[PDB]
Amino acid sequence: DDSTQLPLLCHFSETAEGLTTIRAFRHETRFKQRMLELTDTNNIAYLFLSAANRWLEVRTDYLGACIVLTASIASISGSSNSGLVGLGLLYALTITN
Amino acid sequence: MSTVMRLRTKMPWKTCWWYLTSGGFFLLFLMIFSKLLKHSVIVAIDYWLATWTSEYSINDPGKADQTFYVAGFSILCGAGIFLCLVTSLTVEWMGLTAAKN
Amino acid sequence: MLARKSIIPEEYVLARIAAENLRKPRIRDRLPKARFIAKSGACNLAHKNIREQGRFLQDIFTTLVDLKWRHTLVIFTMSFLCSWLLFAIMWWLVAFAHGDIYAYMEKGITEKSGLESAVCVTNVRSFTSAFLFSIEVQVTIGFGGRMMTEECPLAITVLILQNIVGLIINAVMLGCIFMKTAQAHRRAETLIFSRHAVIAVRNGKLCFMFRVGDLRKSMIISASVRIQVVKKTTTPEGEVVPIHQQDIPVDNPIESNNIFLVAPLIICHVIDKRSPLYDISATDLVNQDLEVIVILEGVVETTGITTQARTSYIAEEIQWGHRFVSIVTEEEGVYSVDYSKFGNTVRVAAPRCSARELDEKPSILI
Amino acid sequence: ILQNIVGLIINAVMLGCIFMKTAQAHRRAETLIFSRHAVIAVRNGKLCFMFRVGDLRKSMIISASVRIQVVKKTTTPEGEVVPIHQQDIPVDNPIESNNIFLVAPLIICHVIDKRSPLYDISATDLVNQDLEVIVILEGVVETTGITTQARTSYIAEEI
Amino acid sequence: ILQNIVGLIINAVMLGCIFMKTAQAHRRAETLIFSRHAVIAVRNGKLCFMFRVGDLRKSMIISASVRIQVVKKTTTPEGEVVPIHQQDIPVDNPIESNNIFLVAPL
Amino acid sequence: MSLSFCGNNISSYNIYHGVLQNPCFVDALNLVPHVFLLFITFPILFIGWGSQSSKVQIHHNTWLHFPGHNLRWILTFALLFVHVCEIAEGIVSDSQRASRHLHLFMPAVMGFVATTTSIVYYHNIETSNFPKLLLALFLYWVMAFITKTIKLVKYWQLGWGMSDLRFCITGVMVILNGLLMAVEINVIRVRRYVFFMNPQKVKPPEDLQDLGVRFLQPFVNLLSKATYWWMNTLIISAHRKP
Amino acid sequence: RAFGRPILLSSTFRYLADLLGFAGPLCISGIVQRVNEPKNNTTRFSETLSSKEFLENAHVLAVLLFLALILQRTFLQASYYVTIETGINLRGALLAM
Numbered sequence A: 001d002d003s004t005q006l007p008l009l010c011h012f013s014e015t016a017e018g019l020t021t022i023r024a025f026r027h028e029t030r031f032k033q034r035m036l037e038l039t040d041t042n043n044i045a046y047l048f049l050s051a052a053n054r055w056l057e058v059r060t061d062y063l064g065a066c067i068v069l070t071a072s073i074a075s076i077s078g079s080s081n082s083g084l085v086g087l088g089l090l091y092a093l094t095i096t097n
Numbered sequence B: 001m002s003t004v005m006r007l008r009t010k011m012p013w014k015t016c017w018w019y020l021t022s023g024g025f026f027l028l029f030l031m032i033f034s035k036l037l038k039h040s041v042i043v044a045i046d047y048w049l050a051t052w053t054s055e056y057s058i059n060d061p062g063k064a065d066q067t068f069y070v071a072g073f074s075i076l077c078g079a080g081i082f083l084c085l086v087t088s089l090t091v092e093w094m095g096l097t098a099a100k101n
Numbered sequence C: 001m002l003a004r005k006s007i008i009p010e011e012y013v014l015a016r017i018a019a020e021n022l023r024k025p026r027i028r029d030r031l032p033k034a035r036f037i038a039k040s041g042a043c044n045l046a047h048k049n050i051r052e053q054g055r056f057l058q059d060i061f062t063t064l065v066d067l068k069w070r071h072t073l074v075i076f077t078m079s080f081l082c083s084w085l086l087f088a089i090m091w092w093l094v095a096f097a098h099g100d101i102y103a104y105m106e107k108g109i110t111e112k113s114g115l116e117s118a119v120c121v122t123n124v125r126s127f128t129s130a131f132l133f134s135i136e137v138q139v140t141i142g143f144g145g146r147m148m149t150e151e152c153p154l155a156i157t158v159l160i161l162q163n164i165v166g167l168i169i170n171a172v173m174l175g176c177i178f179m180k181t182a183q184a185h186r187r188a189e190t191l192i193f194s195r196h197a198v199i200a201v202r203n204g205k206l207c208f209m210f211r212v213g214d215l216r217k218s219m220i221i222s223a224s225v226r227i228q229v230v231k232k233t234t235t236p237e238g239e240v241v242p243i244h245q246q247d248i249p250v251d252n253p254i255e256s257n258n259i260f261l262v263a264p265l266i267i268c269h270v271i272d273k274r275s276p277l278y279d280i281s282a283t284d285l286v287n288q289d290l291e292v293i294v295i296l297e298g299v300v301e302t303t304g305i306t307t308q309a310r311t312s313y314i315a316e317e318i319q320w321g322h323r324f325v326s327i328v329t330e331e332e333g334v335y336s337v338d339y340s341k342f343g344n345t346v347r348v349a350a351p352r353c354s355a356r357e358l359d360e361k362p363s364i365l366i
Numbered sequence D: 001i002l003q004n005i006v007g008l009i010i011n012a013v014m015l016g017c018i019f020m021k022t023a024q025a026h027r028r029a030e031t032l033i034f035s036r037h038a039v040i041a042v043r044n045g046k047l048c049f050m051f052r053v054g055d056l057r058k059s060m061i062i063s064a065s066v067r068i069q070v071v072k073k074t075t076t077p078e079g080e081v082v083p084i085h086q087q088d089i090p091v092d093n094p095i096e097s098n099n100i101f102l103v104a105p106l107i108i109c110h111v112i113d114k115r116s117p118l119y120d121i122s123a124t125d126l127v128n129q130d131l132e133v134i135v136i137l138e139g140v141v142e143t144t145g146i147t148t149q150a151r152t153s154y155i156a157e158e159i
Numbered sequence E: 001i002l003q004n005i006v007g008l009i010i011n012a013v014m015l016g017c018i019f020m021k022t023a024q025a026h027r028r029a030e031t032l033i034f035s036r037h038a039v040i041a042v043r044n045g046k047l048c049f050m051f052r053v054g055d056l057r058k059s060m061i062i063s064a065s066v067r068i069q070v071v072k073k074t075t076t077p078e079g080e081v082v083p084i085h086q087q088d089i090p091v092d093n094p095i096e097s098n099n100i101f102l103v104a105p106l
Numbered sequence F: 001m002s003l004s005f006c007g008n009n010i011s012s013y014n015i016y017h018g019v020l021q022n023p024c025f026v027d028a029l030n031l032v033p034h035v036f037l038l039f040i041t042f043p044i045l046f047i048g049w050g051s052q053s054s055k056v057q058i059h060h061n062t063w064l065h066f067p068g069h070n071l072r073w074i075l076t077f078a079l080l081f082v083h084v085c086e087i088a089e090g091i092v093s094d095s096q097r098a099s100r101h102l103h104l105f106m107p108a109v110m111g112f113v114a115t116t117t118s119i120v121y122y123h124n125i126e127t128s129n130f131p132k133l134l135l136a137l138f139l140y141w142v143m144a145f146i147t148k149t150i151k152l153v154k155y156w157q158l159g160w161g162m163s164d165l166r167f168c169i170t171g172v173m174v175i176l177n178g179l180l181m182a183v184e185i186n187v188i189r190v191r192r193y194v195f196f197m198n199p200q201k202v203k204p205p206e207d208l209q210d211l212g213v214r215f216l217q218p219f220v221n222l223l224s225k226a227t228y229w230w231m232n233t234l235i236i237s238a239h240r241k242p
Numbered sequence G: 001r002a003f004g005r006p007i008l009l010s011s012t013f014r015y016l017a018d019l020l021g022f023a024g025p026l027c028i029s030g031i032v033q034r035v036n037e038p039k040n041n042t043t044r045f046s047e048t049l050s051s052k053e054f055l056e057n058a059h060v061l062a063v064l065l066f067l068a069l070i071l072q073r074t075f076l077q078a079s080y081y082v083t084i085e086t087g088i089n090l091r092g093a094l095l096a097m
Ligand SMILES: Nc1ncnc2c1ncn2[C@@H]1O[C@H](COP(=O)(O)OP(=O)(O)OP(=O)(O)O)[C@@H](O)[C@H]1O
Pocket: C192, C193, C194, C195, C339, C340, C341, C342, C343, C344
């Protein structure tokens, strides 16, 4: 991501200081088809980062939910006072989050 | 530079040691002590609430002598709040001093 | 959780070695390589966008015959278990409906009756018994403490159906086992090729040589050697022949393309006018887009199966100026060859000009 | 005794039927594909007859061979009459040999010499002319080892 | 269940082995014969090398081919001394093709 | 005593006064379609379908989801959940009794395994365009409807009531199975797998065509779109090379 | 009306997941209020299930909570992914403009 954001700004900046020359030499389409490519590479880098972070969250949340089940069943069929059932349930739920 | 098979897979964990005890050595143990105390108090208030709640599960008729449970809950909650206020200040002080040095 | 809320840092300064190092090339070639066929068989072309022909269940059966031995046993066992179970359930339902379960339970709770004169299928009382009766009927065991009386015709229909389907299963599975046992010699192909190619000097002209050998104690019959050069050309009228394969003679005492393969050999190829190797020089033969294919064909007398072995050469691997060490050596009482000197090559006097000129300048000296 | 023997024979025969079925499972259908029509181009300062052959298999055809024939109603100068006579046209390789290796689609070519019957024909008047070009491609499949031969033809209307 | 499955599989394997023998029934050992001496004689005023080959079996072989080689330690002109040099030699038939018909001793 | 499927009591297996009118027999007839589907589909899926009948080195990269995609997966998941609920209710009810009467529980577990295997069949069918095979699924679902339907009516003829859990479970399952049957019919209509004039023709979808499409999140199945399986490969590829 | 539909779809999924998410506290209360009071014997129980009765089978509610959590986390994460992709497309269009 940090590697695909430096060029995407630089290009814009260039096309901002040289408008008279750029619009004279009539190379507009050659530059637009480059702005599009730069911005698309940057967007795909960001999208893959966001998908990876969400992937991690989904997997770890399912692991936490499995913990929730294996804690509730352990506390249900066991020999313990109700204080350590209520505390256990609540804390095992927060651990998941 | 062959980091991926070998360098990347292990965390730096050595520059990290320098960062942890960076501003000195007495600005770290304060953070560790305050963190552990705050976390233990934050668990203990709920533990006490559970014990008080559980001790009267059967005593349906008389909800009396509830001054001890209330006193315990209030004192533990106040102490926990104080430790919570302390710990963050300790951590931020450590970070600021480490950055300065 | 929202790592970069503070977005303010932008265009403050980066100004660095990203590519403006000036002492390191910015470019990253990354060195991808494409060859017509891989170094170890497996022709690597790219068919795509071909009008597909769908599928048909005969292809599924065709897959069934071609399986590794550690999966045929598994499919065998699963087939047998599923068949026994399915017919056990059918028998259990038949026993339920005809009023046999109730009769046996009521007259065996009190042993006073001892009545088995009116039952659909004797001595089937539970699902366990049904799943032991189905065993006694499918495998032709027939323990026979459980006869089938003649009355309930639904049971007889189920028996006919199950016996015939069981025979089908047995016949198909026996066929699979026999087919896989007959074609059991056909392990794989084990033709060993030298990797590096020399261009020595011999018999007044250059060459093109490598080494090939076998490992199976059966030599290969009617072996044939074909050598081709792969390059893109165009007509003088200019049409793009995308990857033209050109056939080139492999020299021999009578100009015929059989070779007898017992001790490893040199496979010469004299460069002459028609050969595309007329125009390649010493310092030239590191830069070129060429691919020389070698195709070996024969049959193995043991298994009686025709085999074709493929390999590929590129101009980058070929190392001018060498030849192959004489691997053989007359031993104490019998010839021998050490394949350990397979890829070993040595250097000897090698002219640096092109055979294009090795007759143009008529001095064997270069 | 009679019934047991008959049952044994019946079981053996049907077992043989299943073995033959399994053996003849693998082959499915012919798979070498020839073009809709051919071409007659100019290549290397002399006209050449070209056609296109492709493969659809996963394996490759061992020892493939291609043969080309010219069908024409013919006579002999001394008077004999030949009704649907065949012949053969020399398929060309730089080595005068006919084995061909087919992994990429290929364009088989044949060069017109003074001795092929495909030399005295005109250009405009091919479409109205009694000829036929037969292509026969044989080989041996590597996976199952069954020799196969696939055929096709091109006529005047489709050249 | 375990014993039944093992028994049926064993029956299949044994049937297959017996099938292999019943398929190789027609196979036998080496059956072509060459003399115990070559000879070197004069044929049409030319000094030529000849030997004898025969078949001692029931059928007539198809599409035979007789190839002859010389294994010798020659001297390579430029040091590529290859000790066991195999050089092919041309058999004779007025069509310049090797194939030979084997009915009687040849 | 034994390990029963209608209890340890003799009068629970009788077949007088209605062979389809005794509840345990209706339970078995419901058990039949599930095991039939399982026994047809486990060997068929195991036998593999990968025979390279042509040059398939770059043909495996394309697969086009069948006409009705999202409703089938979501409804099948709903059926899995409803069957889980029925299993749970059965287990609890058996746990409130003396013997181990199995007619409340085992049919539901068999249904669970059968629905899971049904979705397995759908996935393995879809990857390889071969529409004919999915006809099997049609039969399964259709057959299933009949059996389950009888239970409802045979409850309604005895008036078990609309307040009881079992009535709710059976009704939910009936209507969900019907909707899935509708999905199958629509697939038959759009893909032309049996008796339209001829099988239809389509071009496989355009991202997968160009080998630049790698962020394949928009192009994969909803149960895999939900647990982000599309990224899986790349992440486990973090050891080999950057 | 241009690049906003998927945000509505994400909001629908988010609302449904948010509604199902509260099953943690309620199931915790149910399980706790079942485990405490003693119910050893002699209460008539011939009829198999009463709608109200199913909800408090203490072990049962644990399974219901497990499934509810493992569904809520997946639905919420799906919502996040859809809205993220919408945002990335919106940024790309705005930069191009
Ligand atoms: N003794 C051998 N056994 C098996 N294969 C061999 C042997 N010698 C050479 N080869 C084959 O030669 C090919 C070239 O391999 P490589 O270049 O690694 O070794 P080499 O230089 O040819 O021989 P060596 O390894 O003895 O130096 C390989 O495909 C290999 O299979």
